[PDB]
C-alpha cells in the first residue's frame, strides 16, 4: 500500500566513491578494481573551462599530479589515460569493496538512482529519469561532479551516468561510464542548447496503473481510443508518441489490473484535454513521468536486492 | 542548482538488516551489537492479529523458536524479552558492521529516511515526514514490517522509526526503537482512528525559501502580515499554526535570502487564498511540506556524511 519515488539502496556504491584532486580542483571519482573513473575536467582550472584543449592540458601532467584518496586512505596513481570525457586513473590498490558491476548506456525515459557526493563523501540519494532531451533534473552543487547514477539488477550494480556539468538553464548534463555524453553536450562552459523537454508517455501510463492498483480510480472511463487518435492528442501537449513496443511493455500491468492499455490511453487523453480539475492522483496534482513500467512492477511486488 | 526529495545514504543501515522468523511469520529485524530488534507481532499468526495477548503468546516460546539470519549467516538466540511493542532477541554474535548509532524519538513534522526491506533484504530508500497525526505515507507491502527509519547526523545513525502496521485507511503506523508507538495506535488488526492530517506550515515556508534560492520567485509579494493574522488564515486551510520557535528556526534561511519570515508568510497566505493559478513551484503544483528547514540548509549547502 502507498507509492513513493523510491531509490535503490546505495551501500554498494558508497564504498566506491573517492576524492580526486589535480592541482586546485577536487571532485568525485568512482573506484572499481584498480582504476579510478572521474570527469576529465578535473585537470582544468575555473579559467580553462571556457575553452579547454584537454589534450594540451593533460600532457603537462604526470602520474604524481593526481591525488586520489578514499577516506583517509591515499592511493597511488601508476598510469593515466583519457577515454572520451572521462579520465581513467590506474592505481596500485584494487578496491576491496568492488561489487559485481557493469557499465551500461541507458535510453531516454529510463530511471536510475543518483548518489550525490562532495569531496568523495556521500550526501544523499534520489531517483530520476533521463529526460527525452538527454538532461536530468537533479540536485547538484559546486564540487558534486563525478557523482554517479546507477541501477541495481539482481546482485549487480549497473553504472549508467556520471555528472559533468550544470548548464546555464540550471539543468544537468553528464556521460556514461565510457565518457560519451548523453545528448549533444560538451564539457565546456558555454551556452549550450537543450531541446524540448517532452513528457514520457509510457511512464505516465505505468503510473496511472500504479494509481489504480492503490485505489485511485476516479479518472477511469469506459471510453476507448486507438494509437493514432491518442498520438494526435499527445503530440499537441508535448507528449512522447506511444508505439507498439510501449503497449507490449505495459502488458503485465494490463494483466494484473484487468484494464486494457488502449482504455488507459483514453483516460489519459481526457486528463490532457480537461485537466485535473483540482483532484490529485497518488498525492500529486501533476501527471508523473519518472516511474517506468518496471519500477511500478518492482515496487508493487516487493523485489529485493542482494 | 535544482531541488530533489533526497534520502540519506543507506549503506550503514543495509548492514544491520536481518530476517527474523518465528513459526510461520517472517519479517525484518535490526541487528545492532549482539541484539536483534523486531516487531513483537512476529510471534502472531495472521489469525492471532485481531486480538493478541502478547504475554500469553510469548510465554509458549523459547529461545530456539526464533530463527534470525543475516544473509546466509544463521544467528543463535540466547535470550529474549519484550520491551513495549518490540522484541529484543539477544544473540551470540555482535554485528561486525554495527555503526555508531543512537535511538531517538522524533516529533511530528520531522523527516527521516526509510529503508524498505523484505525478508531481511533491502529493496529501496525514500524520504518522508512524520505527519501531525503520527502516521506516515509510506510504501509498504506484506512482509515489510520491521523496516526502519533513520537520520544520519555526523557519522552517527539516528534510528527513529520501525514499521509495524498498515491501517485500513492505507496509511502506516509504527514505533520508536524502544517499542512505543507514535500516536494512539496499537499492534492489533482493528479499526483505528487517525486524526486530521494537517499541513506542516514551517516546512512549507522552508520550501518556499528553497524555491527563491533556486530562482522561482513569482509568488513573492511585498505584502506583510503578523503571526496572528497569518494563523487565522492558516487554521482555515488545516495548516499547523506558526509559533515564534518556528520563526527562529527559519532565521538562517531569512538571512541568506534577504526575505523576512513574516514577508514569506504573507506570500504563502495569498497562495492559500488564491491558489497556484496553474503555475508550479520547484516543479510542483501543490505546496510541499516534507522538507524541514534543516533539510533545505543541508541540501543547498552540500553537507556530507561519513
Coordinates of C-alpha atoms in Angstrom, one line a residue:
Chain A
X1 CA 0.0 0.0 0.0
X2 CA 1.2 3.5 -0.8
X3 CA 3.5 4.7 -3.6
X4 CA 6.8 6.6 -3.2
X5 CA 9.6 7.8 -5.5
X6 CA 12.0 5.1 -4.4
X7 CA 15.8 5.0 -4.8
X8 CA 17.9 1.9 -4.9
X9 CA 19.9 1.2 -1.7
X10 CA 23.3 3.0 -2.1
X11 CA 25.5 0.8 0.1
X12 CA 27.4 -0.9 -2.7
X13 CA 28.2 2.4 -4.4
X14 CA 29.1 4.3 -1.2
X15 CA 32.2 2.1 -0.9
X16 CA 33.4 3.1 -4.4
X17 CA 33.4 6.8 -4.0
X18 CA 36.8 8.5 -3.7
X19 CA 38.1 12.1 -3.9
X20 CA 40.2 13.1 -6.8
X21 CA 42.4 16.2 -6.7
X22 CA 44.5 17.5 -9.5
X23 CA 46.1 20.9 -8.8
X24 CA 43.5 23.1 -7.1
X25 CA 40.4 21.2 -8.5
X26 CA 38.8 18.5 -6.4
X27 CA 35.8 16.3 -7.4
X28 CA 34.5 12.8 -7.0
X29 CA 35.8 9.6 -8.6
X30 CA 34.5 6.0 -9.0
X31 CA 36.9 3.4 -7.7
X32 CA 36.4 -0.1 -9.3
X33 CA 39.1 -2.7 -9.2
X34 CA 42.4 -0.8 -9.6
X35 CA 41.2 2.2 -11.7
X36 CA 39.5 5.4 -10.7
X37 CA 37.0 7.0 -13.1
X38 CA 36.4 10.7 -12.9
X39 CA 35.5 13.7 -15.2
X40 CA 38.4 14.8 -17.3
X41 CA 37.7 18.4 -16.5
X42 CA 39.4 17.8 -13.1
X43 CA 42.5 18.9 -14.9
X44 CA 41.0 22.3 -15.7
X45 CA 41.0 25.4 -13.6
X46 CA 37.9 27.6 -13.5
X47 CA 39.5 29.8 -16.1
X48 CA 40.3 27.0 -18.5
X49 CA 36.6 25.9 -18.6
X50 CA 35.6 28.3 -21.3
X51 CA 37.8 26.8 -24.0
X52 CA 39.9 23.8 -22.8
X53 CA 42.3 21.9 -25.0
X54 CA 42.2 18.7 -23.0
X55 CA 45.0 17.1 -25.0
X56 CA 47.3 20.0 -24.4
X57 CA 46.3 20.4 -20.7
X58 CA 46.7 16.7 -19.9
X59 CA 50.2 16.4 -21.4
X60 CA 51.6 18.8 -18.8
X61 CA 50.5 16.4 -16.1
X62 CA 52.2 13.3 -14.8
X63 CA 51.1 10.4 -12.6
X64 CA 52.1 12.2 -9.3
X65 CA 50.0 15.3 -10.1
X66 CA 46.8 13.3 -9.3
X67 CA 45.9 12.8 -5.7
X68 CA 43.2 10.2 -5.1
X69 CA 42.1 9.5 -1.5
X70 CA 39.4 7.1 -0.2
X71 CA 38.6 8.5 3.2
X72 CA 41.9 8.7 5.0
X73 CA 43.5 6.2 2.5
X74 CA 45.9 7.7 0.0
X75 CA 46.0 5.9 -3.4
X76 CA 49.0 6.0 -5.8
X77 CA 48.4 6.7 -9.5
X78 CA 50.7 4.5 -11.6
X79 CA 49.0 5.1 -15.0
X80 CA 46.6 7.6 -16.6
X81 CA 44.7 7.9 -19.9
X82 CA 41.8 9.8 -21.4
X83 CA 38.8 7.9 -22.7
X84 CA 36.5 10.4 -24.4
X85 CA 35.4 12.7 -21.5
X86 CA 36.5 10.5 -18.5
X87 CA 39.9 10.2 -17.0
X88 CA 40.9 6.6 -16.1
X89 CA 43.4 6.8 -13.2
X90 CA 45.2 3.4 -12.8
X91 CA 46.1 2.9 -9.2
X92 CA 48.1 0.3 -7.3
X93 CA 45.4 -0.9 -4.9
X94 CA 42.3 -2.8 -6.1
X95 CA 39.2 -1.7 -4.2
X96 CA 38.3 -4.5 -1.7
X97 CA 34.7 -3.3 -1.8
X98 CA 34.3 -3.6 -5.6
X99 CA 30.8 -5.0 -6.2
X100 CA 29.7 -7.0 -9.2
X101 CA 29.2 -4.2 -11.7
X102 CA 28.8 -3.4 -15.4
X103 CA 28.7 -0.2 -17.4
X104 CA 25.5 0.4 -19.4
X105 CA 24.3 3.3 -21.6
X106 CA 20.6 3.9 -20.9
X107 CA 17.9 5.4 -23.2
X108 CA 15.7 8.4 -22.6
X109 CA 12.8 7.7 -20.3
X110 CA 14.8 5.2 -18.2
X111 CA 15.2 5.9 -14.5
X112 CA 18.2 5.5 -12.2
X113 CA 19.4 6.4 -8.7
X114 CA 22.0 9.2 -8.2
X115 CA 24.3 9.3 -5.2
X116 CA 25.1 12.9 -4.8
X117 CA 28.7 13.3 -3.3
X118 CA 31.0 16.1 -2.3
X119 CA 34.8 15.6 -1.8
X120 CA 34.4 11.9 -2.0
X121 CA 31.7 11.6 0.7
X122 CA 28.1 10.7 0.1
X123 CA 25.5 13.3 0.8
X124 CA 22.2 11.9 -0.4
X125 CA 20.4 9.6 -2.8
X126 CA 17.4 10.3 -5.1
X127 CA 15.6 8.8 -8.1
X128 CA 15.3 10.5 -11.5
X129 CA 14.8 9.9 -15.2
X130 CA 16.8 10.6 -18.3
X131 CA 14.7 13.3 -20.0
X132 CA 14.0 12.9 -23.7
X133 CA 16.3 15.9 -24.3
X134 CA 19.2 14.0 -22.6
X135 CA 19.3 16.2 -19.5
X136 CA 18.4 15.3 -15.9
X137 CA 16.6 17.5 -13.3
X138 CA 19.0 16.8 -10.4
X139 CA 20.3 18.5 -7.3
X140 CA 24.0 19.4 -7.8
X141 CA 26.2 22.0 -6.1
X142 CA 29.7 23.0 -6.9
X143 CA 32.0 20.1 -6.4
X144 CA 29.4 17.4 -7.0
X145 CA 30.8 16.4 -10.4
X146 CA 31.8 12.8 -10.8
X147 CA 28.7 11.7 -8.8
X148 CA 27.3 8.7 -10.4
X149 CA 23.9 7.3 -11.4
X150 CA 23.2 3.6 -11.1
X151 CA 20.7 0.7 -11.1
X152 CA 20.8 -2.5 -9.0
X153 CA 19.9 -5.5 -11.1
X154 CA 20.0 -8.8 -9.2
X155 CA 23.3 -8.5 -7.2
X156 CA 25.0 -6.4 -9.9
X157 CA 25.4 -2.6 -9.9
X158 CA 24.7 -1.1 -13.4
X159 CA 26.5 2.2 -13.6
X160 CA 24.9 4.4 -16.2
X161 CA 25.7 8.0 -15.5
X162 CA 28.4 10.4 -14.3
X163 CA 27.6 14.1 -13.7
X164 CA 29.9 16.6 -15.5
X165 CA 28.1 20.0 -16.0
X166 CA 25.4 22.4 -14.9
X167 CA 24.1 24.3 -17.9
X168 CA 23.1 28.0 -17.8
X169 CA 19.5 26.9 -17.7
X170 CA 20.1 25.1 -14.4
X171 CA 19.7 21.5 -15.7
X172 CA 22.4 18.9 -15.6
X173 CA 24.4 17.0 -18.3
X174 CA 26.7 14.1 -18.0
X175 CA 28.2 11.0 -19.6
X176 CA 28.1 7.2 -19.5
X177 CA 31.0 5.4 -17.9
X178 CA 32.8 5.2 -21.2
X179 CA 33.0 9.1 -21.3
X180 CA 30.4 9.6 -24.1
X181 CA 28.0 12.4 -23.2
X182 CA 24.3 11.8 -23.2
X183 CA 22.9 14.3 -25.7
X184 CA 24.8 16.9 -27.8
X185 CA 26.6 18.5 -24.8
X186 CA 30.3 19.1 -24.4
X187 CA 32.4 19.6 -21.3
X188 CA 32.9 23.3 -21.9
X189 CA 31.4 26.2 -20.0
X190 CA 29.5 27.8 -22.9
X191 CA 25.9 28.4 -24.0
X192 CA 24.5 25.1 -25.0
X193 CA 21.1 24.4 -26.5
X194 CA 18.8 21.8 -24.8
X195 CA 15.8 20.8 -26.8
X196 CA 12.1 20.5 -25.9
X197 CA 11.6 18.6 -22.7
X198 CA 8.6 16.3 -23.5
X199 CA 6.7 14.1 -21.2
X200 CA 7.5 10.3 -21.2
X201 CA 4.0 9.0 -22.1
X202 CA 4.7 5.3 -21.4
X203 CA 5.9 6.3 -17.9
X204 CA 2.7 8.3 -17.2
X205 CA 0.6 5.2 -18.2
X206 CA 2.6 3.0 -15.8
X207 CA 1.9 5.4 -13.0
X208 CA -1.8 5.5 -13.8
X209 CA -1.8 1.7 -13.4
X210 CA 0.0 2.1 -10.1
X211 CA -2.7 4.5 -9.1
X212 CA -5.5 2.0 -9.9
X213 CA -3.6 -0.7 -8.0
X214 CA -3.5 1.6 -5.0
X215 CA -7.2 2.6 -5.1
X216 CA -7.2 5.9 -7.0
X217 CA -9.7 5.2 -9.8
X218 CA -11.7 8.4 -10.4
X219 CA -10.0 9.1 -13.7
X220 CA -11.1 5.8 -15.2
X221 CA -13.7 5.9 -18.0
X222 CA -15.0 3.2 -20.3
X223 CA -14.0 5.3 -23.3
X224 CA -11.6 3.7 -25.7
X225 CA -9.4 5.0 -28.5
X226 CA -6.7 3.9 -30.9
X227 CA -3.0 4.5 -31.0
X228 CA -3.3 7.1 -33.8
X229 CA -6.1 9.1 -32.3
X230 CA -4.3 9.1 -29.0
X231 CA -0.9 10.2 -30.5
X232 CA -2.6 13.1 -32.3
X233 CA -3.7 14.5 -28.9
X234 CA -0.4 13.5 -27.2
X235 CA 1.7 15.4 -29.8
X236 CA -0.4 18.5 -29.1
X237 CA 0.6 18.5 -25.4
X238 CA 4.3 17.7 -26.0
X239 CA 3.9 14.1 -25.0
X240 CA 6.2 11.4 -26.5
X241 CA 4.3 9.3 -29.0
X242 CA 3.2 5.8 -27.9
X243 CA 4.4 2.9 -30.0
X244 CA 3.5 -0.8 -30.1
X245 CA 6.7 -1.6 -28.1
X246 CA 5.3 0.6 -25.3
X247 CA 1.9 -1.2 -25.4
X248 CA 3.7 -4.5 -25.1
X249 CA 5.8 -3.3 -22.1
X250 CA 2.6 -2.3 -20.3
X251 CA 1.3 -5.9 -20.8
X252 CA 1.9 -7.2 -17.3
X253 CA 0.3 -4.2 -15.7
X254 CA -2.7 -4.6 -18.0
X255 CA -3.0 -8.3 -16.9
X256 CA -2.9 -7.6 -13.2
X257 CA -5.4 -4.8 -13.2
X258 CA -7.8 -6.0 -15.9
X259 CA -7.7 -2.7 -17.7
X260 CA -6.7 -2.6 -21.4
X261 CA -3.8 -0.3 -22.4
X262 CA -5.9 1.5 -25.0
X263 CA -8.6 2.0 -22.4
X264 CA -6.0 3.6 -20.1
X265 CA -4.9 5.7 -23.0
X266 CA -8.5 7.1 -23.4
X267 CA -8.5 8.1 -19.7
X268 CA -5.2 9.9 -20.1
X269 CA -6.4 11.8 -23.1
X270 CA -9.4 13.2 -21.2
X271 CA -7.0 14.3 -18.4
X272 CA -4.8 16.0 -21.0
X273 CA -7.8 17.8 -22.5
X274 CA -9.8 18.6 -19.4
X275 CA -7.1 18.8 -16.7
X276 CA -7.0 17.5 -13.1
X277 CA -10.0 19.7 -12.1
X278 CA -8.1 20.2 -8.8
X279 CA -8.2 16.5 -7.9
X280 CA -5.0 14.6 -7.3
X281 CA -3.6 11.1 -8.2
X282 CA -1.4 9.3 -5.7
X283 CA -1.0 12.6 -3.9
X284 CA 0.1 14.6 -7.0
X285 CA -1.6 17.5 -8.9
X286 CA 0.5 16.8 -12.0
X287 CA 1.0 13.8 -14.3
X288 CA 4.1 12.0 -13.1
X289 CA 6.6 10.6 -15.6
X290 CA 9.6 9.4 -13.6
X291 CA 8.4 5.8 -13.0
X292 CA 9.0 3.2 -15.7
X293 CA 6.7 0.2 -16.0
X294 CA 9.4 -1.9 -14.4
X295 CA 9.7 0.5 -11.4
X296 CA 6.0 0.0 -10.9
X297 CA 6.1 -3.8 -11.1
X298 CA 9.2 -3.7 -8.8
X299 CA 7.5 -1.6 -6.1
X300 CA 4.1 -3.1 -6.2
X301 CA 5.6 -6.7 -6.0
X302 CA 8.4 -6.3 -3.4
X303 CA 11.5 -7.1 -5.4
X304 CA 14.6 -7.1 -3.1
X305 CA 18.3 -6.9 -3.9
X306 CA 21.5 -8.5 -2.6
Chain B
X1 CA 21.1 24.1 -8.6
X2 CA 17.9 22.0 -8.6
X3 CA 16.0 20.6 -5.7
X4 CA 15.1 16.9 -5.0
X5 CA 13.4 14.9 -2.3
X6 CA 16.7 13.4 -1.1
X7 CA 17.2 10.4 1.2
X8 CA 20.2 9.7 3.4
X9 CA 22.7 7.1 2.0
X10 CA 21.6 3.8 3.3
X11 CA 24.9 1.8 3.4
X12 CA 25.3 1.9 7.2
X13 CA 21.8 0.6 7.7
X14 CA 21.9 -2.1 5.0
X15 CA 24.5 -4.0 7.0
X16 CA 22.2 -4.1 10.0
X17 CA 19.1 -5.7 8.4
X18 CA 18.4 -9.3 9.2
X19 CA 15.5 -11.7 8.7
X20 CA 13.5 -12.9 11.8
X21 CA 11.3 -16.0 11.6
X22 CA 9.2 -17.3 14.4
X23 CA 6.9 -20.1 13.4
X24 CA 5.5 -19.3 10.0
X25 CA 5.9 -15.5 10.3
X26 CA 8.9 -13.8 8.8
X27 CA 9.8 -10.1 9.0
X28 CA 12.8 -7.8 9.3
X29 CA 15.0 -7.1 12.3
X30 CA 17.6 -4.5 13.2
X31 CA 20.9 -6.1 14.3
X32 CA 23.0 -3.8 16.5
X33 CA 25.8 -5.2 18.7
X34 CA 24.5 -8.6 20.0
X35 CA 20.8 -7.9 20.0
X36 CA 18.1 -8.0 17.2
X37 CA 15.2 -5.6 17.4
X38 CA 12.0 -6.6 15.6
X39 CA 8.2 -6.0 15.9
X40 CA 6.7 -8.3 18.6
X41 CA 3.9 -9.3 16.4
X42 CA 6.4 -11.7 14.7
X43 CA 5.1 -14.2 17.3
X44 CA 1.5 -13.9 16.0
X45 CA -0.1 -15.8 13.2
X46 CA -2.5 -14.0 10.8
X47 CA -5.4 -15.2 12.9
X48 CA -4.0 -14.0 16.3
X49 CA -3.8 -10.5 14.9
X50 CA -7.3 -9.4 15.7
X51 CA -7.0 -9.9 19.5
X52 CA -3.5 -11.0 20.6
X53 CA -2.4 -11.5 24.2
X54 CA 1.3 -10.9 23.6
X55 CA 2.2 -12.0 27.2
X56 CA 0.3 -15.3 26.8
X57 CA 1.6 -15.9 23.2
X58 CA 5.3 -15.1 24.1
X59 CA 5.4 -17.5 27.0
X60 CA 4.8 -20.6 24.9
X61 CA 8.0 -19.6 23.0
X62 CA 11.6 -20.4 23.9
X63 CA 15.0 -19.1 22.5
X64 CA 15.2 -21.8 19.8
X65 CA 11.8 -20.9 18.4
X66 CA 13.3 -17.7 16.9
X67 CA 15.3 -18.1 13.7
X68 CA 17.4 -15.0 12.9
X69 CA 19.6 -15.0 9.7
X70 CA 21.7 -12.3 8.2
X71 CA 22.1 -13.3 4.5
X72 CA 23.4 -16.9 4.7
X73 CA 24.6 -16.4 8.3
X74 CA 22.4 -18.2 11.0
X75 CA 22.4 -16.4 14.3
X76 CA 21.7 -18.1 17.7
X77 CA 19.2 -16.6 20.1
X78 CA 20.4 -16.9 23.7
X79 CA 17.9 -14.5 25.4
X80 CA 14.7 -12.8 24.6
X81 CA 12.5 -10.2 26.2
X82 CA 9.6 -7.9 25.3
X83 CA 10.0 -4.1 25.6
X84 CA 6.7 -2.4 24.9
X85 CA 6.0 -3.4 21.3
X86 CA 9.5 -4.6 20.2
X87 CA 11.1 -7.9 20.8
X88 CA 14.7 -7.8 21.8
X89 CA 16.4 -11.0 20.6
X90 CA 19.8 -11.4 22.4
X91 CA 22.2 -13.3 20.1
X92 CA 25.7 -14.6 20.5
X93 CA 27.4 -12.7 17.6
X94 CA 27.9 -9.0 17.8
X95 CA 27.3 -7.4 14.4
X96 CA 30.8 -6.5 13.0
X97 CA 29.0 -3.8 10.9
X98 CA 27.4 -2.0 13.8
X99 CA 27.8 1.7 13.2
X100 CA 27.8 4.5 15.7
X101 CA 24.1 4.8 16.5
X102 CA 21.5 6.1 18.9
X103 CA 17.8 5.7 19.4
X104 CA 15.7 8.9 19.2
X105 CA 12.1 9.7 19.3
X106 CA 11.2 12.3 16.7
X107 CA 8.4 14.9 16.8
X108 CA 5.7 15.4 14.2
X109 CA 6.9 17.4 11.2
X110 CA 10.4 15.9 11.3
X111 CA 11.7 14.0 8.3
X112 CA 13.7 10.7 8.0
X113 CA 14.7 8.1 5.5
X114 CA 13.0 4.7 5.4
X115 CA 14.9 1.6 4.1
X116 CA 12.1 -0.6 2.9
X117 CA 13.1 -4.3 3.2
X118 CA 11.6 -7.7 2.6
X119 CA 12.9 -11.0 4.2
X120 CA 15.9 -9.1 5.5
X121 CA 17.0 -7.7 2.1
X122 CA 16.9 -4.0 1.2
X123 CA 14.5 -3.0 -1.6
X124 CA 14.6 0.8 -1.7
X125 CA 15.1 4.0 0.2
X126 CA 12.8 7.1 0.3
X127 CA 12.4 10.3 2.4
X128 CA 9.2 11.1 4.4
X129 CA 7.8 13.1 7.2
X130 CA 6.1 12.2 10.4
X131 CA 2.6 13.6 9.8
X132 CA 1.0 15.7 12.6
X133 CA -1.5 12.8 13.2
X134 CA 1.5 10.4 13.8
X135 CA 1.1 8.4 10.6
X136 CA 3.5 8.2 7.7
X137 CA 2.6 8.0 4.0
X138 CA 5.0 5.2 3.0
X139 CA 5.3 2.3 0.6
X140 CA 4.9 -1.0 2.4
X141 CA 3.9 -4.4 1.2
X142 CA 3.2 -7.6 3.2
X143 CA 6.4 -8.6 5.0
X144 CA 8.0 -5.1 5.1
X145 CA 7.4 -4.8 8.9
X146 CA 10.5 -4.2 10.9
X147 CA 11.8 -1.8 8.2
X148 CA 13.4 1.1 9.9
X149 CA 13.5 4.9 9.6
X150 CA 16.7 6.8 10.3
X151 CA 18.7 10.0 10.1
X152 CA 22.5 10.4 9.6
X153 CA 23.9 13.0 11.9
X154 CA 27.7 13.5 11.6
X155 CA 29.0 9.9 11.5
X156 CA 26.2 8.5 13.7
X157 CA 23.0 6.8 12.6
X158 CA 19.9 8.1 14.5
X159 CA 17.3 5.3 14.4
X160 CA 13.8 6.8 14.9
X161 CA 11.2 4.5 13.5
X162 CA 10.2 0.9 12.9
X163 CA 7.2 0.0 10.8
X164 CA 4.5 -2.2 12.4
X165 CA 1.1 -1.8 10.8
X166 CA -0.9 -0.8 7.7
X167 CA -4.2 0.7 8.8
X168 CA -7.5 0.1 6.9
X169 CA -7.2 3.6 5.5
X170 CA -3.9 2.6 3.8
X171 CA -1.5 4.7 6.0
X172 CA 1.3 3.3 8.1
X173 CA 1.9 3.3 11.8
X174 CA 5.0 2.3 13.8
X175 CA 7.1 2.7 16.9
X176 CA 10.3 4.2 18.1
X177 CA 13.2 1.8 18.8
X178 CA 12.0 1.5 22.4
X179 CA 8.7 0.0 21.3
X180 CA 6.5 2.9 22.0
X181 CA 4.1 3.7 19.2
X182 CA 3.9 7.1 17.5
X183 CA 0.3 8.2 18.0
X184 CA -2.6 6.4 19.7
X185 CA -2.1 3.2 17.6
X186 CA -1.8 -0.4 18.9
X187 CA -0.3 -3.5 17.2
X188 CA -3.7 -5.1 16.7
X189 CA -5.6 -5.6 13.4
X190 CA -8.7 -3.5 14.2
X191 CA -10.4 -0.3 13.1
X192 CA -8.2 2.5 14.4
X193 CA -9.0 6.3 14.1
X194 CA -6.4 8.6 12.7
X195 CA -7.0 12.3 13.2
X196 CA -6.9 15.2 10.8
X197 CA -3.8 15.2 8.6
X198 CA -2.8 18.9 8.6
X199 CA 0.0 20.6 6.6
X200 CA 3.3 21.3 8.3
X201 CA 3.4 25.1 7.8
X202 CA 7.0 25.6 8.9
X203 CA 8.1 23.0 6.3
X204 CA 6.1 24.8 3.6
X205 CA 7.9 28.0 4.4
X206 CA 11.3 26.3 4.3
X207 CA 10.5 25.0 0.8
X208 CA 9.4 28.4 -0.4
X209 CA 12.8 29.7 0.7
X210 CA 14.4 26.8 -1.2
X211 CA 12.4 27.9 -4.3
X212 CA 13.6 31.5 -4.0
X213 CA 17.2 30.3 -3.7
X214 CA 16.7 28.2 -6.9
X215 CA 15.2 31.1 -8.9
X216 CA 11.4 30.5 -8.5
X217 CA 10.2 33.9 -7.3
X218 CA 6.9 34.7 -9.0
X219 CA 5.0 34.1 -5.7
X220 CA 6.9 36.9 -3.8
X221 CA 4.9 40.0 -2.9
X222 CA 5.9 42.9 -0.8
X223 CA 2.8 42.4 1.4
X224 CA 3.4 41.7 5.0
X225 CA 1.4 40.3 7.9
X226 CA 1.6 39.3 11.5
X227 CA 1.7 35.9 13.2
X228 CA -1.9 36.2 14.4
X229 CA -3.4 37.3 11.1
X230 CA -1.5 34.6 9.3
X231 CA -2.6 31.9 11.8
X232 CA -6.2 32.9 11.3
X233 CA -5.9 32.1 7.6
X234 CA -3.7 29.0 8.2
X235 CA -6.2 27.4 10.6
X236 CA -9.0 27.8 7.9
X237 CA -7.0 25.7 5.5
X238 CA -5.9 23.0 8.0
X239 CA -2.4 24.3 8.4
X240 CA -0.4 23.9 11.6
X241 CA -0.1 27.2 13.5
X242 CA 3.2 29.0 13.3
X243 CA 4.9 29.8 16.6
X244 CA 7.8 32.0 17.5
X245 CA 10.0 28.9 17.7
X246 CA 9.3 28.3 14.0
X247 CA 10.2 31.9 13.1
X248 CA 13.5 31.4 14.9
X249 CA 14.3 28.2 13.1
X250 CA 13.7 29.9 9.7
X251 CA 16.3 32.5 10.8
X252 CA 19.3 31.2 8.8
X253 CA 17.1 31.0 5.6
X254 CA 15.9 34.5 6.2
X255 CA 19.5 35.7 6.4
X256 CA 20.8 34.1 3.3
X257 CA 17.8 35.2 1.1
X258 CA 17.2 38.7 2.5
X259 CA 13.5 37.9 2.8
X260 CA 11.8 38.3 6.2
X261 CA 9.9 35.4 7.6
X262 CA 6.7 37.4 8.1
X263 CA 7.1 38.6 4.4
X264 CA 7.3 35.0 3.3
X265 CA 4.2 34.3 5.4
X266 CA 2.3 37.0 3.5
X267 CA 3.2 35.3 0.2
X268 CA 2.0 31.9 1.5
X269 CA -1.3 33.3 2.6
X270 CA -2.1 34.7 -0.9
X271 CA -1.2 31.2 -2.3
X272 CA -3.6 29.6 0.2
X273 CA -6.4 32.1 -0.7
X274 CA -5.9 32.4 -4.5
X275 CA -4.3 29.1 -5.3
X276 CA -1.5 28.2 -7.7
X277 CA -3.4 29.5 -10.7
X278 CA -1.9 26.6 -12.6
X279 CA 1.7 27.7 -12.1
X280 CA 4.2 25.5 -10.3
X281 CA 6.9 25.9 -7.7
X282 CA 10.1 23.8 -8.0
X283 CA 8.2 21.6 -10.4
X284 CA 5.2 21.0 -8.1
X285 CA 1.6 22.1 -8.4
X286 CA 1.0 21.6 -4.7
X287 CA 2.5 23.1 -1.6
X288 CA 5.2 20.7 -0.4
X289 CA 5.6 20.0 3.4
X290 CA 8.2 17.2 3.6
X291 CA 11.3 19.3 3.8
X292 CA 12.4 20.7 7.2
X293 CA 14.3 24.0 7.4
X294 CA 17.4 21.8 8.2
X295 CA 16.9 19.6 5.1
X296 CA 16.9 22.8 3.0
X297 CA 20.0 24.1 4.6
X298 CA 21.6 20.7 4.2
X299 CA 20.8 20.4 0.5
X300 CA 21.5 24.0 -0.5
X301 CA 24.9 23.9 1.3
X302 CA 26.4 20.4 0.4
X303 CA 26.6 18.7 3.8
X304 CA 28.3 15.3 3.5
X305 CA 28.3 12.3 5.9
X306 CA 30.9 9.8 7.0

